[PDB]
Amino acid sequence: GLSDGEWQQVLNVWGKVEADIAGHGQEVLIRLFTGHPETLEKFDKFKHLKTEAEMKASEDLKKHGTVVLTALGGILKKKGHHEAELKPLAQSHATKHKIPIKYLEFISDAIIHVLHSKHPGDFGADAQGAMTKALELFRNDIAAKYKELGFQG
C-alpha cells in the first residue's frame, strides 16, 4: 500500500482538485474523451459531443466531472480503507456501464496529465509518485472486483 507520508502527499495534491472540482473534473473527462474517443461511446449522454468545443461548453459534462472526482476524492480520503466506497463503483462500472479496466487506466493517466497541466511546476516528483500509487491502488482494487464478476469488457 501507500506509506503515511505518501497518503499525506496524495491528500495534499487533492487540495488542488478541491479548490476547483468542476474544472479539474471537466479537464479530466475531456482529456479522456479526446485521447480515447471510444470512451465517449460508453456515455450515451456525451455521445452527441462531436467536438472538444462542445465538450468544453457542456454543463452536464462539468457536472459529471464533479460527480466523478467527488467519488474519487471520497475514496482517496479513506487512505486505502475504501472497500465500502469502491465495491459499488466497481460493480456499477462493470455490470451497468461496461467499462473495461483499460478505460480506468486511461482516466488515471488523464488525472496525472491534468494535474501537471493545471499546476505546471507545482506537481512535484514525490507528489506524482504518491498520486500514481493511489490511482493504481484504486484501479487494482476495482480490477479485483472485475475478476470476481468475470468482467472484461
Ligand code: HEM
Ligand atoms: C476515477 C474513475 C471513475 C470514477 C470515480 C467514476 C465515478 C462514477 C460515478 C460516481 C458515477 C455515478 C454513479 C454510478 O453509476 O456508479 C459514474 C457513472 C458512470 N461512469 Fe464512471 N467513474 C470513473 C471512471 C469511468 C470511466 C473511465 C468511464 C468510461 C470510460 C465511466 C463511465 C461511466 C458511465 C457511462 C456512467 C453513467 C453515466 C450516466 O449516464 O449518468 N466511468 N461514474
